[PDB]
Amino acid sequence: TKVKILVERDATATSFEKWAKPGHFSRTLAKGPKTTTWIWNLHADAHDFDSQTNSLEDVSRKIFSAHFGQLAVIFLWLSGMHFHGAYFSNYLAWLNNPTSIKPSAQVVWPIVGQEILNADVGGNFQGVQITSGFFQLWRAEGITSEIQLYWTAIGALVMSGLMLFAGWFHYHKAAPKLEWFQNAESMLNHHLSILLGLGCLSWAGHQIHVALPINKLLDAGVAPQEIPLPHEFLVNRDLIAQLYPSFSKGLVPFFSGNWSEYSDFLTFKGGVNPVTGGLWLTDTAHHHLALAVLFIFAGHMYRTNWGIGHSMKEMLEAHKGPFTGEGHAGLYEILTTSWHAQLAINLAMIGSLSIIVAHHMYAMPPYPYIATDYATQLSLFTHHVWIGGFCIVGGAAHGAIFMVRDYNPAKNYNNLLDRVIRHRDSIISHLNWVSIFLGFHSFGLYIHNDTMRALGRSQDMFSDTAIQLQPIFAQWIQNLHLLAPGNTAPNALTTASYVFGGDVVSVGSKIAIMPIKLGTADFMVHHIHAFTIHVTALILLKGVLYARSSKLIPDKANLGFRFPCDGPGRGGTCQVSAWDHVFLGLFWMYNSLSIVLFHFSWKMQSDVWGSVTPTGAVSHITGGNFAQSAITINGWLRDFLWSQASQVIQSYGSALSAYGLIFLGAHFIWAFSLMFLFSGRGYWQELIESIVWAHNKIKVAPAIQPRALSITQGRAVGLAHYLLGGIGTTWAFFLARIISV
Amino acid sequence: ASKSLPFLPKPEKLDGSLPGDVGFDPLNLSATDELGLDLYWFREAEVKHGRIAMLAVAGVLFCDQIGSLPGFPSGKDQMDLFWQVFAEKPNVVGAGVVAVSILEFISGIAITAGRKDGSREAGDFNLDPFNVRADPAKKATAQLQEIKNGRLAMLASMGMIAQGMTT
Amino acid sequence: SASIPFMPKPEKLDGTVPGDVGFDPLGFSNWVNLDFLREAEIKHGRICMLAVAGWVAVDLGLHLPGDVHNVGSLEAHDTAVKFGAMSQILLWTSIFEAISTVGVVQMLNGSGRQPGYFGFDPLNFSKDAASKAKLELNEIKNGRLAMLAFSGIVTQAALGNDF
């Protein structure tokens, strides 16, 4: 039995003595503060476990228990959300009439006149309209009562307590040994077969037994009062057979193999439910059941204790070709001996997955009455896009950290990492060329269109009525997806999404989802997206590859991961560390995602979202002005920013006034960040010297000498405030533009 | 050399000490020393499955057809009867369920204790009223007859379940 | 092991806690302070003994002069929170509980205070001759009995009027 449980009992004593010795973790900070810089360092190195102990076992035990703490925090957050839904929300009124009632689960105390923020959402209720789509999620779960929300919150609180206790227990009482952590095969088997496999299976069971019948009754018009409790759907089979007359057969078809008998509630119709405007619940049930089967199957791939299984070490060592020397030899050691490598991969994947979620959820609204809630759709899309970008850049940063710290050339001789480091110059040069090519061509299309439109030469622009750049490949793919039902997906009644083509799904006179046509403006904006993504990849990849050494600093690794510079020599050596590459990559990621969000918002407002008449006529929010106005920079400035910013600037005196205040505050913080971004530390140090003289002249002099922020901290603060200001500005802009509806 | 099946050898782990042992272990599951089962779990599970199966057989017989305690009407085979009894007197059936649950929790603690030390034998709860443990022969005979007639209980209950579940 | 003879001999038990009989299947005491557990058990028992006495008292008897006391035990909590008597009893019990929280912390620190020691013997029913241990066994046992009995009474009265 190679895979076995190993723990140390009473690893760490539990006491408050350390709580009164801040900075105990690090050897340098444990000596007490001489200057204010110490303070900052104590908050910067708090979670840098690798720099606090030289033993991997101790770092692993800290990471495990910190993850337990994060789970406790997340469970507390879920408990709070559910409790505010049960006690402070109009969930029942929204249930009764989802179309008219505006979701809201937050109430403001009237203390300074802020009660104006209590909007007239409806349902004899006043509160702040929420855009987290929690009401749609709860309806998809067939909640239909506030007692269930209350008990959901209580369970979440108990789970948060359990997570906290588990963290404490697994640090101070039973801390697993290092050999326990270094089980990639067993961990993958357990996370795939159970965490993701049985999780899907259990959720599919819930949907089949709870969500499906309740939502079917709700769609039929049954008032939530008359819907029997979910447990009533588990005791009397006939009560469910009325809705899906396949339970009558029971589980015998499942074991007999006649799964076709379950097609009543396990369908593959796809498309969207015309009533609620969301995905069919039966489709999601079949989806989760299939995913559960696949995950359970995939969880048996790796060898843990019985001979059968895959050894990932051999798997990696086996893949090597003529062009790559030793192939994937040494990657298993890297990913089982350094948390930074694993964190880089996991953060990159989580970020990309979050962006994929954002793209898929809007195209195929998964919850009932979420499609027509334009405010929820936009908020969810932008939120998950931002999360994905942040996670991607974090993965880059931790890859760089691994390269600086946990990279060992002795164990990486002529493998993939060695070869990549050995043709990094070619990689970066070509990425630079492609970035310049993309930027030039894509952005110069916009500049050319703007110049021609300013000169009155409209026939010379890159527009539909002018030189045309049709995204022919995307249109061809859309056509194929349109034709898929019946030909390449014969058992699928309807296309996966109505974006590609088909009817106009509208719920309550609102266009839930309709086909999206791609024109020259779509071509140009997509190439802008590609340009920005390529530039961000350039910055971050350059930071990762040149993290250890460069033709400027052959010994950069000795300087550490984040350092300000290496002096004004060799010309200038500012921002030469990989941390500074992350610092710039964050700006470029923010820029790219801002463009992505603007594209999504304008395209959806001008081409998808709108209203329908009984005849079938379509009237979009902005009247389809995207095709002929999204092709010039002035068009974006006028028809998108200036035109759609009316709601924020005019929100004063209404329930949305908070959005205008936050708009101004975000502008203020964004401008404030420039103070740190542009200026340097010496000026501020001298100014502080003068101020310290002034204090001393009155015998006021802190023992902790004041110090200007370190160069690295100056950059970090500037970047943090820049991102906060930009994100908040767009947050207020979108929410006020999409809540005045 | 197994007495039950001469063509496949008897397991090393099975020495015949446990009752009802005829060396009938083809797959050699008694040899498990992983995931915490180790043939003491299997023995306990056998005794428990068999006891509850004997109770199940006696219950389904329903010869008196007075619903066990008075006030319980009507006679039905399995599922409708269970639901109907739960419907008419949820208080009593819940009480029985919780009695079983309490004995189950205490039993699980006891299983862990028996794993750690041999003080608790498999299938042993010290519930013997006769309190007969001085001489082995009678104890062994009673235990092995329990296991045999409970195995028959389980097979009979399968004979019950099979009816009405097929196509 | 006492009572349950097949359980694993409760650890850190006996030699204290007059009410103990050796029944610790889960054995929380092993990994938590026994003093804290004793305090919790004693306080739950006292509060619930008073709760049983109140519930039986409210049972069509001893109602206070105010008209609001025509209301029954089940509706008593609602009528009291509306009347505000419940908030006041909360106030006073909270004061007592904070003053006792100081004592609980001291007991845990090693102050030497016994679990339920509140020095409350106006009629000193206890005496060296009476035997404090004999007096406590009854206290703890009748407290556990009251805990379980009140749980049952409230539940099965929420089902149907016990009397």
Ligand code: CLA
């Ligand atoms: C986790 C997410 C979350 C969030 C963001 C909120 C946010 C909010 N809640 Mg909700 N709530 C949550 C979870 C959450 N709650 C949970 C889990 C519960 C169940 C218990 C509730 C139950 C609840 C109720 C019942 C009510 C709210 C209310 C409120 C609002 C006012 C809170 C406030 O300032 O009161 C004042 C809070 C304070 C002044 C905080 C106390 C200050 C402490 C003492 C500072 C101590 C810091 C300390 C020094 C740090 C070091 C640690 C030290 C202990 C050692 C606000 C919108 C109220 C509301 O909306 O009114 C209409 C309201 O009535 N919440």
Ligand code: CLA
């Ligand atoms: C076969 C049953 C089944 C059904 C009915 C659905 C139904 C759905 N899926 Mg799911 N899905 C399935 C299986 C299924 N899925 C599997 C097996 C995968 C793994 C790749 C996915 C991955 C997936 C993603 C990533 C997303 C969906 C989404 C959706 C929804 C989009 C609307 C639609 O018409 O979907 C039609 C669905 C399809 C056309 C996908 C079919 C995928 C096929 C079956 C792949 C099969 C792979 C094959 C088994 C590989 C085996 C290799 C192995 C042997 C080594 C819908 C509820 C979307 C959603 O809910 O967003 C809100 C979404 O973003 N599905």
Ligand code: CLA
């Ligand atoms: C799984 C997620 C994850 C984990 C576990 C870590 C863990 C770590 N990171 Mg990584 N990182 C992540 C995600 C993650 N990071 C992401 C997404 C990014 C991209 C931004 C980075 C970028 C990054 C860099 C560039 C660096 C690290 C560093 C570190 C280490 C020290 C962190 C520390 O001391 O915190 C200290 C935490 C703080 C000081 C709190 C500051 C939080 C921000 C600035 C403010 C948040 C504002 C709030 C959300 C909104 C405010 C509202 C306003 C109105 C008030 C530690 C190993 C550092 C290191 O050297 O490690 C070796 C380092 O240099 N990380």
Ligand code: CLA
């Ligand atoms: C809006 C202002 C602006 C502009 C135009 C640029 C432009 C550029 N940046 Mg910079 N950048 C900016 C703001 C800007 N950045 C800010 C605010 C930051 C702070 C975070 C950065 C940080 C930054 C980094 C860290 C990196 C860049 C990179 C790049 C290049 C991307 C490749 C490209 O598009 O080449 C094509 C050039 C353009 C599209 C510029 C417009 C040229 C037009 C189309 C034609 C002009 C007319 C023509 C020349 C007429 C000639 C005759 C005339 C002289 C009379 C490019 C030089 C990357 C780089 O250099 O590597 C590739 C890089 O790594 N930038």
Ligand code: CLA
């Ligand atoms: C980079 C973006 C971009 C693009 C694609 C264009 C494209 C165009 N512009 Mg515009 N323009 C731009 C930016 C751009 N412009 C900017 C930034 C400005 C502001 C300064 C203007 C201002 C402007 C004006 C004022 C006018 C134009 C005009 C034109 C047209 C004729 C230009 C010409 O004579 O071609 C010259 C082309 C060449 C010399 C060929 C060189 C390029 C070749 C194709 C590269 C091939 C490389 C090859 C693939 C390598 C293969 C290697 C292999 C052998 C191994 C053409 C449609 C004119 C017009 O009216 O259009 C109708 C006009 O009057 N432009």
Ligand SMILES: CC1=C(C/C=C(\C)CCC[C@H](C)CCC[C@H](C)CCCC(C)C)C(=O)c2ccccc2C1=O
């Ligand atoms: C303004 C500025 C300073 C001076 C700024 C200092 C010393 C920060 C002062 C912080 C005060 C004392 C804390 C209180 C601030 C707010 C009232 C609230 C707290 C905000 C967070 C710390 C939580 C630098 O030291 C510096 C260094 C390098 C590049 C740019 C700059 C730079 O721009």
Ligand code: SF4
């Ligand atoms: S300006 Fe600042 S970052 Fe640049 S070399 Fe001088 S000290 Fe270093």
